[PDB]
Amino acid sequence: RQINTEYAVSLLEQLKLFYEQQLFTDIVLIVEGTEFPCHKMVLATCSSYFRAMFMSGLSESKQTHVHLRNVDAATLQIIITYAYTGNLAMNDSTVEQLYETACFLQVEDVLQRCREYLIKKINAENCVRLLSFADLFSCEELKQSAKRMVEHKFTAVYHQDAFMQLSHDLLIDILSSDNLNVEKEETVREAAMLWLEYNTESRSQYLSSVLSQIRIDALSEVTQRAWFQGLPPNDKSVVVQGLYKDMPKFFKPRLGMTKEEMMIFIEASSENPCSLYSSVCYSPQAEKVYKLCSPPADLHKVGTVVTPDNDIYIAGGQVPLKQTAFRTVNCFYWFDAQQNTWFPKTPMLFVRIKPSLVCCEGYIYAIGGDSVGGELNRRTVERYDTEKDEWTMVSPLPCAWQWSAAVVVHDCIYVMTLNLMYCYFPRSDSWVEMAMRQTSRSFASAAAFGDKIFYIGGLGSSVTVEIYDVNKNEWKMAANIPAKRYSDPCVRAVVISNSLCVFMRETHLNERAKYVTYQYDLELDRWSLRQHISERVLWDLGRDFRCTVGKLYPSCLEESPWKP
Amino acid sequence: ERQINTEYAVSLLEQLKLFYEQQLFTDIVLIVEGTEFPCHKMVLATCSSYFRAMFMSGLSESKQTHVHLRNVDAATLQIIITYAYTGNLAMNDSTVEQLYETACFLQVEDVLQRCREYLIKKINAENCVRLLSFADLFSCEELKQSAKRMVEHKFTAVYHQDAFMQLSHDLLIDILSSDNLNVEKEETVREAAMLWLEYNTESRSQYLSSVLSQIRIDALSEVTQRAWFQGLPPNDKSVVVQGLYKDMPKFFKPRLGMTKEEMMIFIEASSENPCSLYSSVCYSPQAEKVYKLCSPPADLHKVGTVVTPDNDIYIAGGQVFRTVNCFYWFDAQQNTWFPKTPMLFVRIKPSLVCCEGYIYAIGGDSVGGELNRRTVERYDTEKDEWTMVSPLPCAWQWSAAVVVHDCIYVMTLNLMYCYFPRSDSWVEMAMRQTSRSFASAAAFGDKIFYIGGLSVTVEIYDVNKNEWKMAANIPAKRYSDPCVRAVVISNSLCVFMRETHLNERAKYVTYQYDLELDRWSLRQHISERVLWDLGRDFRCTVGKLYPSCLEESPWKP
Amino acid sequence: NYVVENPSLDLEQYAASYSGLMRIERLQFIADHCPTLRVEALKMALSFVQRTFNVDMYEEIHRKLSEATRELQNAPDPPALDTAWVEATRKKALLKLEKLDTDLKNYKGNSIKESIRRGHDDLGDHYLDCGDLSNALKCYSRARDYCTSAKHVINMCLNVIKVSVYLQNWSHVLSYVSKAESTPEITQAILTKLKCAAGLAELAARKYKQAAKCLLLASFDHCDFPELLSPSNVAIYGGLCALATFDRQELQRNVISSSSFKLFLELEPQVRDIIFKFYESKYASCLKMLDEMKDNLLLDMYLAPHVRTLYTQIRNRALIQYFSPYVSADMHRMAAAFNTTVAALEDELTQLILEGLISARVDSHSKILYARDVDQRSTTFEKSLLMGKEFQRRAKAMMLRAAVLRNQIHVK
């Protein structure tokens, strides 16, 4: 266990009193002309450098004035007070110098805290800076976790200025890695070319190594004469060298070109009765069913969103409290497309049940979702910031709605309910009244294809389809999906292969559920049979399962072993 | 101000504790008769109000790595230093005096309060005068007054302790001149002073001129001068003159201890104000007055009473209904209740019996779940602790227990067992021919008088004869349910019974019973103008109290 | 299911006979399942739950008592928990527990197995008093490691048995009963306590034949055993299970030979008469006492679901034995051998014949139950002819299989 806490607090606050009131100070730190009167005890408890500074036997053992150099006054003051009061106020700016002084003074505890701060602060705009920082100081855990987030993010942006100022060893590890996420192998080629041409002949010796990590499908085509233009004059040790050099190193395709348009399913019927629900996916091209990681702490009643950058997020949901037992939590998670795991993120402010997650302008919008408040503003609409990793409230929606769906069209949020629709204008944070539907239908989903909204189904569900045009602002009927009579189809609207397809599972009387998808002809207003899902690969999923459009890697994921 | 301590404040205490035991970054070391105590100035500053000045004043002490502190014990300083490093005092019962002494040297105000509370709670039977002089040597006013009242009672009880002989003149004057002497006679204080004065020589004769005038003049014209004639130094003339001057003056007044009237302590009476449920009152057999007492917990009820031969009142167990194993003791002068060491089991209506100076609690729903439901537990009035004893033979409910001839006797429906304190065993006794419960017994002389049960059953038992016999039936009005209470009054067996009829008011009357007459002669009838209704669950016990300390209970006749 | 209305339970004796968390569970279920008496049951429950510093179940019981008192304030047209207890109870419970924890962890730095085991048992006892089931288990599951002697193993088994009853982990009870019995070489009657725990656990686990066998071996010298089950209910538990499973000669031997169940039957004269009436073929008086025993003991903890099955078995067994020494048994007389009607017995008899073990035929004309004694030879010949026909059919099937396999006939 521990020891007496009531005296632990008394001594702690009294040492703080003896620090603010400078009485029992035998050693003072001289940093850039700033006096830091303190004790040898407190500096010893935190830092592992002062233990080699005082109890070492050097000249400073008896000297009462030490001139600590290559440090910062603010960083020293916060470190000293942290050793004195433990309140480590970590902002978003001074953490860089905080780690520098923590490593210099070898203070293990603050090193772990700032590493825990940086493991949460890793994002898009500082991935390169943190990796270089993680390369400068040995922080392998941060270095590896950065590298993974770095690997995906460089491929996406590949335009940050700190990428040019990187060590040769770091670049070789980044480029030769098999975790890059690229639609083509040519974007990494030009990224290396611009990095090599960024500086003078100091990149010439590294050019013999950077090309040794890139595949040979581009080491004989264009971007070889371009280097000859940029070659130092009369250098005959490079042009001939690269002429006969690209024989070895085993051309092999990378892993980033292995993303296929797949239908991600959540809360599917668990195969083993020991678990409540599971998550699976259907492959429209591979015609197989790949398993997915379980929702975080079997998070049920959640919502899914896929950003244009192909990122999966989970918000809302409830966990069974420790027979009916369920408690709602506002936890937020992010799915790793390669590690097959859900990385936790900043939680929301209010708990939600079945929230509608919609992405727009890089912000994740969660509209409604049976909030816990229940006050006059029983909607609690709030967006998420993907660069600052925080949540910001938005303009409340006019009318309280339940069991609603939302889509994004023309950089605007379009949320749909039983019969009403309101469009949110993110630039002014306002809501405008939209067209009114003539049919009262709920418990349905909508897919945003182009500049039109397709509300498919509604109430089991039915085959009613009401097409809404943003430019026309009107709801019109197109047709009804031809399905077997005396059945209860489960419609799922989704956009795939630049076309509006439907994932409709139908069940007949005294018969098992049948899976089949149809391709809706936009100009002909007819659902055509695109593909029939055989039951030998896909089993029953349930009723409360959700579907979304996204891309996943079949290599990182594993096939689900289950009998037809 | 934000002073959060979750999983950090403990860490700093540990980190400093690891460095102290590993001897890291010590800048000051204490030399204690050659023993080295490497420690730190910061921790010494917070713990002691003297060590802060030991390292701050501009004297040569500040620039001195080795300080030779004397007049301090190594063990006491070490336990103080470790208390400054972990906070757990873990004080024993033997080294309390020296630990307080060193806390009076280096001013450890924190441990000083802890030791003061420990000392103020453990003035049991013998160290009272010893620590009173200790409280006289070191100013501990709160403990000084608490010991003063305690000494005033206990010293008068023993008045033969050797530790009392070595006392300062001022403390003796305060003790002896106080009007809190628990003495039924004025001669025992006279001889106590005489033996104190004849213990030494002329130096104490100087104090004799000031202490001889602090008792009542009735004892200053006595043999004291005659015994002082043989004990006076030769060629002393003026001392005899000042001795003769102490006969007439200085306000001869009666003391307080002589008001030790035998009375009856009652508990769970009919409360006057409806906001309160029960109350504790008293009755004066001679003064014919009804006094009141303060409820010990003021909210807990169903307690048991016991009176030691030294006239002490104790309360144990009870429910407040949750059962609490708390313990209390009644102050004979402050009219309050000082708690004591609680029991290990929460009893409901325990039966406490005093024998050989030990309090024996027999039965009373200990916890119920014990494997052997037939158990008892005793108390130590000297060591202040509970000691487990031999378990009860048979399970009994609504039982009674008394003490006769320094032996424990417990009575139930029909069975009786005698507990032999010397061997800690139970022995089977005579069996009663009538099965009656919900009754109590009285230990009068060498005979046990089991009165009542369901009535008016009078079944007398003798220890020397070991037999049960009938005497007579109490004269009571028919169509009534008497509530019998048998207790020893004025060295005479008597009863206190109340009769209740239908559509009739309760009447209180006590009768005088004769051994050879087998008749309850009318001794005194308690008038309703002074005593009101008591109730059904009330208890009665015999004890001596003080009228001045207590207060009369107001009630309209 | 249960929660029926019926008067005349003695709350004082049933509460006082047991003690501990077992008593707490008994008071709660009795209040929850016996209306028109829940208030005093809850009032006595809360008055005892506040003792020994309970925390979570107190809130549930106080809320139920508050609801019950509110209900009483509207019918003949809620107590305060005194949250000062929360401040008082928590502060005392923490301080003593932290003091005890400090001692044990220091003892863990002293490395003494018995002291660690004893301290862990004390921690488990405190956690059970605090109302922490799993917390006590881990303390008890750390005391199991540091055992030194056979008595230490016995104490370890008893503690796990006690906790797993509250946890309803009866598998852990039975495993530790087997460990405590079989290991140490099968005045201090220790095996009696183990047998009592096993019988109660088996009965709660829907077992009757072995539970009665274990309960019959329980000696009355155990006397005080309130942490698991009172002797009064133990006798009732043994008697009902024995009546449902043990046959006549099986009943007579076991009850008499045990000589402790005779003392148990003295404690409960009602079941003693029921068994005696069962022996003497007086099932009319036997079952009418049983129905009287039904209501008084259907508000029992581990009995209420099982007693209905036990009583149903008793009714079936009584009918089977009654008709056994009868050739032309008048259904009127058999109906008169109970308070049942003629039609109800006929339906009950018909159900018994359909299930079996009565071997009878009902003659509804004169309402006389005639026993069936079929000729062994006729049935033997009939089933032998059926067996021969089946054997010929299977031989034809096998010959066809051989024909289709030899000629390689299969769907491509």
Short mmCIF file of N, CA and C in Angstrom, two decimals, chain A residues 127-237:
data_model
loop_
_atom_site.label_atom_id
_atom_site.label_comp_id
_atom_site.label_asym_id
_atom_site.label_seq_id
_atom_site.Cartn_x
_atom_site.Cartn_y
_atom_site.Cartn_z
N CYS A 127 3.96 16.75 -37.03
CA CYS A 127 4.48 15.40 -37.14
C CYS A 127 5.97 15.41 -37.50
N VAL A 128 6.36 16.27 -38.44
CA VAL A 128 7.76 16.34 -38.84
C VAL A 128 8.62 16.92 -37.72
N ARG A 129 8.12 17.96 -37.04
CA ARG A 129 8.89 18.59 -35.97
C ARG A 129 9.08 17.63 -34.80
N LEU A 130 8.04 16.88 -34.45
CA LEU A 130 8.15 15.94 -33.33
C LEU A 130 9.06 14.77 -33.67
N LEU A 131 9.00 14.27 -34.91
CA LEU A 131 9.88 13.17 -35.30
C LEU A 131 11.34 13.59 -35.27
N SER A 132 11.65 14.78 -35.78
CA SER A 132 13.01 15.30 -35.69
C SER A 132 13.40 15.51 -34.24
N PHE A 133 12.47 16.00 -33.42
CA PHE A 133 12.72 16.10 -31.98
C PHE A 133 12.91 14.72 -31.37
N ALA A 134 12.11 13.74 -31.79
CA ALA A 134 12.28 12.37 -31.31
C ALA A 134 13.53 11.71 -31.86
N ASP A 135 14.06 12.20 -32.98
CA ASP A 135 15.34 11.70 -33.47
C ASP A 135 16.51 12.33 -32.74
N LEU A 136 16.39 13.60 -32.36
CA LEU A 136 17.47 14.28 -31.64
C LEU A 136 17.70 13.65 -30.27
N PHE A 137 16.63 13.48 -29.50
CA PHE A 137 16.70 12.87 -28.18
C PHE A 137 16.07 11.49 -28.24
N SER A 138 16.76 10.50 -27.66
CA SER A 138 16.31 9.12 -27.75
C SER A 138 14.99 8.93 -27.01
N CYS A 139 13.89 8.87 -27.76
CA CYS A 139 12.55 8.76 -27.20
C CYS A 139 11.77 7.71 -28.00
N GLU A 140 12.41 6.55 -28.20
CA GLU A 140 11.95 5.47 -29.08
C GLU A 140 10.44 5.27 -29.08
N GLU A 141 9.81 5.30 -27.91
CA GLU A 141 8.36 5.15 -27.85
C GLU A 141 7.67 6.27 -28.63
N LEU A 142 8.06 7.52 -28.38
CA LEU A 142 7.54 8.63 -29.17
C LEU A 142 8.01 8.54 -30.61
N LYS A 143 9.27 8.13 -30.82
CA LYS A 143 9.81 8.03 -32.17
C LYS A 143 9.03 7.03 -33.01
N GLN A 144 8.72 5.86 -32.45
CA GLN A 144 7.95 4.86 -33.19
C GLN A 144 6.51 5.33 -33.40
N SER A 145 5.88 5.87 -32.37
CA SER A 145 4.49 6.30 -32.49
C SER A 145 4.38 7.49 -33.44
N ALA A 146 5.37 8.38 -33.42
CA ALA A 146 5.41 9.46 -34.40
C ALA A 146 5.57 8.85 -35.79
N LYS A 147 6.57 7.98 -35.96
CA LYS A 147 6.88 7.39 -37.26
C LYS A 147 5.65 6.82 -37.95
N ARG A 148 4.79 6.16 -37.18
CA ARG A 148 3.55 5.61 -37.72
C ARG A 148 2.62 6.73 -38.17
N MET A 149 2.41 7.73 -37.31
CA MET A 149 1.58 8.87 -37.68
C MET A 149 2.29 9.73 -38.72
N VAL A 150 3.62 9.80 -38.63
CA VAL A 150 4.45 10.51 -39.59
C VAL A 150 4.33 9.88 -40.97
N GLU A 151 4.39 8.55 -41.03
CA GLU A 151 4.41 7.84 -42.31
C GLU A 151 3.15 8.11 -43.12
N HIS A 152 1.99 8.08 -42.47
CA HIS A 152 0.74 8.36 -43.15
C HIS A 152 0.60 9.83 -43.50
N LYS A 153 1.10 10.72 -42.64
CA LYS A 153 0.81 12.14 -42.78
C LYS A 153 1.74 12.81 -43.80
N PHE A 154 3.01 12.39 -43.87
CA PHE A 154 3.88 12.93 -44.90
C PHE A 154 3.32 12.65 -46.29
N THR A 155 2.87 11.42 -46.52
CA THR A 155 2.32 11.04 -47.81
C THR A 155 1.13 11.92 -48.17
N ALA A 156 0.33 12.28 -47.18
CA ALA A 156 -0.83 13.15 -47.39
C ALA A 156 -0.41 14.58 -47.72
N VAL A 157 0.54 15.13 -46.96
CA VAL A 157 0.87 16.55 -47.11
C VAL A 157 2.10 16.74 -47.99
N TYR A 158 3.22 16.12 -47.61
CA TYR A 158 4.49 16.17 -48.34
C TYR A 158 4.83 17.57 -48.85
N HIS A 159 4.48 18.57 -48.04
CA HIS A 159 4.75 19.95 -48.42
C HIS A 159 5.22 20.79 -47.24
N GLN A 160 5.40 20.17 -46.08
CA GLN A 160 5.85 20.92 -44.91
C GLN A 160 7.33 21.27 -45.03
N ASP A 161 7.67 22.47 -44.55
CA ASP A 161 9.02 22.99 -44.72
C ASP A 161 10.05 22.27 -43.86
N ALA A 162 9.65 21.73 -42.70
CA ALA A 162 10.60 21.04 -41.84
C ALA A 162 11.02 19.69 -42.42
N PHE A 163 10.32 19.20 -43.45
CA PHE A 163 10.73 17.96 -44.10
C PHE A 163 12.09 18.10 -44.78
N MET A 164 12.40 19.30 -45.28
CA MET A 164 13.70 19.52 -45.92
C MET A 164 14.84 19.39 -44.92
N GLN A 165 14.65 19.90 -43.70
CA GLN A 165 15.69 19.87 -42.67
C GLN A 165 15.51 18.59 -41.85
N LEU A 166 15.96 17.48 -42.43
CA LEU A 166 15.91 16.18 -41.77
C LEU A 166 17.23 15.46 -42.00
N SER A 167 17.58 14.59 -41.05
CA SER A 167 18.81 13.82 -41.16
C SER A 167 18.67 12.74 -42.23
N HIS A 168 19.81 12.33 -42.78
CA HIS A 168 19.81 11.31 -43.82
C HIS A 168 19.30 9.98 -43.30
N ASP A 169 19.69 9.60 -42.08
CA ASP A 169 19.25 8.33 -41.52
C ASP A 169 17.74 8.30 -41.33
N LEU A 170 17.16 9.42 -40.88
CA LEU A 170 15.71 9.47 -40.68
C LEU A 170 14.97 9.33 -42.01
N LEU A 171 15.44 10.00 -43.05
CA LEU A 171 14.78 9.93 -44.35
C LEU A 171 14.85 8.52 -44.93
N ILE A 172 16.00 7.85 -44.78
CA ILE A 172 16.14 6.49 -45.29
C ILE A 172 15.16 5.56 -44.59
N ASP A 173 15.02 5.70 -43.27
CA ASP A 173 14.04 4.90 -42.54
C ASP A 173 12.61 5.20 -42.99
N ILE A 174 12.30 6.47 -43.26
CA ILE A 174 10.95 6.84 -43.67
C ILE A 174 10.65 6.29 -45.06
N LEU A 175 11.57 6.48 -46.01
CA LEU A 175 11.28 6.13 -47.39
C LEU A 175 11.32 4.62 -47.60
N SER A 176 12.25 3.92 -46.95
CA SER A 176 12.38 2.48 -47.12
C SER A 176 11.34 1.70 -46.34
N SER A 177 10.56 2.36 -45.48
CA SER A 177 9.53 1.67 -44.71
C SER A 177 8.40 1.19 -45.62
N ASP A 178 7.75 0.11 -45.19
CA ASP A 178 6.64 -0.48 -45.92
C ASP A 178 5.29 -0.08 -45.34
N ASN A 179 5.23 1.08 -44.68
CA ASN A 179 4.00 1.56 -44.07
C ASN A 179 3.47 2.82 -44.73
N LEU A 180 4.07 3.26 -45.83
CA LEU A 180 3.63 4.47 -46.50
C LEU A 180 2.24 4.29 -47.09
N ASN A 181 1.45 5.36 -47.06
CA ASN A 181 0.07 5.35 -47.55
C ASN A 181 0.00 6.28 -48.77
N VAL A 182 0.23 5.71 -49.95
CA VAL A 182 0.25 6.47 -51.19
C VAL A 182 -0.61 5.75 -52.23
N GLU A 183 -1.40 6.51 -52.97
CA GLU A 183 -2.15 5.94 -54.09
C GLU A 183 -1.24 5.56 -55.25
N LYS A 184 -0.05 6.15 -55.34
CA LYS A 184 0.90 5.83 -56.39
C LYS A 184 2.31 5.91 -55.81
N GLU A 185 3.23 5.20 -56.47
CA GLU A 185 4.63 5.18 -56.07
C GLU A 185 5.43 6.34 -56.66
N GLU A 186 4.79 7.22 -57.42
CA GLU A 186 5.48 8.36 -58.02
C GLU A 186 5.51 9.58 -57.11
N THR A 187 4.56 9.71 -56.18
CA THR A 187 4.56 10.87 -55.29
C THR A 187 5.71 10.81 -54.30
N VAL A 188 6.09 9.61 -53.85
CA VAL A 188 7.26 9.48 -53.00
C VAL A 188 8.53 9.74 -53.81
N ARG A 189 8.51 9.41 -55.10
CA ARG A 189 9.66 9.68 -55.96
C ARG A 189 9.94 11.17 -56.06
N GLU A 190 8.92 11.97 -56.36
CA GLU A 190 9.12 13.41 -56.50
C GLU A 190 9.39 14.06 -55.15
N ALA A 191 8.86 13.50 -54.07
CA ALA A 191 9.16 14.02 -52.74
C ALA A 191 10.65 13.87 -52.42
N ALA A 192 11.24 12.73 -52.80
CA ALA A 192 12.67 12.55 -52.62
C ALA A 192 13.46 13.46 -53.56
N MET A 193 12.96 13.65 -54.79
CA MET A 193 13.66 14.51 -55.75
C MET A 193 13.73 15.95 -55.26
N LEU A 194 12.61 16.47 -54.74
CA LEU A 194 12.61 17.84 -54.25
C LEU A 194 13.46 17.98 -52.99
N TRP A 195 13.52 16.92 -52.17
CA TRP A 195 14.40 16.94 -51.01
C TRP A 195 15.86 16.96 -51.41
N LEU A 196 16.24 16.17 -52.42
CA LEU A 196 17.62 16.16 -52.88
C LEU A 196 18.01 17.48 -53.53
N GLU A 197 17.12 18.06 -54.33
CA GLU A 197 17.39 19.32 -55.00
C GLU A 197 17.23 20.52 -54.09
N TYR A 198 16.77 20.32 -52.85
CA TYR A 198 16.61 21.43 -51.92
C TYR A 198 17.94 22.10 -51.59
N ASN A 199 19.01 21.31 -51.45
CA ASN A 199 20.29 21.86 -51.02
C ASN A 199 21.36 21.67 -52.09
N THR A 200 22.60 22.01 -51.75
CA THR A 200 23.74 21.91 -52.65
C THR A 200 24.26 20.48 -52.73
N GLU A 201 25.48 20.32 -53.26
CA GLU A 201 26.08 19.00 -53.45
C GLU A 201 26.19 18.19 -52.17
N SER A 202 25.83 18.76 -51.01
CA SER A 202 25.79 17.99 -49.78
C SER A 202 24.77 16.85 -49.85
N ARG A 203 23.84 16.91 -50.79
CA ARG A 203 22.89 15.83 -51.02
C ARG A 203 23.38 14.81 -52.04
N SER A 204 24.54 15.04 -52.65
CA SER A 204 25.03 14.12 -53.68
C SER A 204 25.42 12.77 -53.10
N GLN A 205 26.12 12.77 -51.96
CA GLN A 205 26.52 11.50 -51.35
C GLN A 205 25.32 10.73 -50.81
N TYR A 206 24.28 11.43 -50.37
CA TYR A 206 23.07 10.77 -49.90
C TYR A 206 22.19 10.30 -51.05
N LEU A 207 22.44 10.78 -52.27
CA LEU A 207 21.62 10.38 -53.41
C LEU A 207 21.89 8.93 -53.79
N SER A 208 23.13 8.46 -53.60
CA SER A 208 23.45 7.06 -53.85
C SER A 208 22.73 6.13 -52.88
N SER A 209 22.26 6.64 -51.75
CA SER A 209 21.56 5.84 -50.76
C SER A 209 20.04 5.97 -50.83
N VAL A 210 19.53 7.17 -51.12
CA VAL A 210 18.08 7.35 -51.17
C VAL A 210 17.48 6.60 -52.35
N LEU A 211 18.17 6.57 -53.49
CA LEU A 211 17.69 5.77 -54.61
C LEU A 211 17.82 4.28 -54.36
N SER A 212 18.72 3.87 -53.45
CA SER A 212 18.84 2.46 -53.11
C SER A 212 17.67 1.95 -52.28
N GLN A 213 16.81 2.84 -51.79
CA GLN A 213 15.62 2.44 -51.05
C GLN A 213 14.33 2.56 -51.85
N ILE A 214 14.33 3.28 -52.97
CA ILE A 214 13.17 3.41 -53.84
C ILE A 214 13.21 2.30 -54.88
N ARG A 215 12.03 1.87 -55.32
CA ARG A 215 11.96 0.79 -56.31
C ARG A 215 12.52 1.24 -57.66
N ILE A 216 12.89 0.24 -58.47
CA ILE A 216 13.56 0.50 -59.74
C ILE A 216 12.60 0.82 -60.89
N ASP A 217 11.29 0.84 -60.65
CA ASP A 217 10.36 1.21 -61.71
C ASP A 217 10.47 2.68 -62.08
N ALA A 218 11.16 3.48 -61.26
CA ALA A 218 11.37 4.90 -61.51
C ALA A 218 12.85 5.25 -61.56
N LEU A 219 13.73 4.27 -61.44
CA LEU A 219 15.17 4.50 -61.46
C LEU A 219 15.77 4.30 -62.84
N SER A 220 14.93 4.10 -63.86
CA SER A 220 15.36 4.06 -65.25
C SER A 220 14.60 5.02 -66.14
N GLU A 221 13.43 5.47 -65.71
CA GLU A 221 12.58 6.42 -66.41
C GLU A 221 12.96 7.85 -66.00
N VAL A 222 12.08 8.81 -66.28
CA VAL A 222 12.32 10.23 -66.05
C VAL A 222 12.64 10.47 -64.58
N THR A 223 13.25 11.63 -64.28
CA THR A 223 13.85 11.99 -62.99
C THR A 223 15.21 11.32 -62.80
N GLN A 224 15.84 10.92 -63.90
CA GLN A 224 17.26 10.62 -63.93
C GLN A 224 18.07 11.65 -64.70
N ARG A 225 17.54 12.17 -65.81
CA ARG A 225 18.19 13.26 -66.52
C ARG A 225 18.03 14.58 -65.78
N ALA A 226 16.97 14.72 -64.97
CA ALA A 226 16.80 15.92 -64.17
C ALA A 226 17.93 16.07 -63.15
N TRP A 227 18.34 14.97 -62.52
CA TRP A 227 19.50 15.02 -61.63
C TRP A 227 20.77 15.34 -62.39
N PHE A 228 20.90 14.83 -63.62
CA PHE A 228 22.06 15.16 -64.44
C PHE A 228 22.14 16.66 -64.71
N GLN A 229 20.99 17.32 -64.86
CA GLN A 229 20.98 18.78 -64.99
C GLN A 229 21.50 19.44 -63.72
N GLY A 230 21.09 18.92 -62.56
CA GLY A 230 21.53 19.42 -61.28
C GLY A 230 22.83 18.85 -60.76
N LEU A 231 23.49 18.02 -61.56
CA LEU A 231 24.76 17.45 -61.14
C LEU A 231 25.83 18.53 -61.05
N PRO A 232 26.77 18.41 -60.11
CA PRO A 232 27.94 19.28 -60.15
C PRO A 232 28.70 19.07 -61.45
N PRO A 233 29.31 20.12 -61.99
CA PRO A 233 29.97 20.00 -63.29
C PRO A 233 31.15 19.04 -63.24
N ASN A 234 31.40 18.39 -64.38
CA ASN A 234 32.49 17.45 -64.66
C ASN A 234 32.54 16.27 -63.69
N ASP A 235 31.49 16.03 -62.90
CA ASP A 235 31.48 14.90 -61.98
C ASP A 235 31.17 13.62 -62.75
N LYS A 236 32.20 12.80 -62.98
CA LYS A 236 32.06 11.55 -63.71
C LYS A 236 31.98 10.34 -62.78
N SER A 237 31.78 10.57 -61.49
CA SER A 237 31.63 9.49 -60.52
C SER A 237 30.18 9.24 -60.14
#
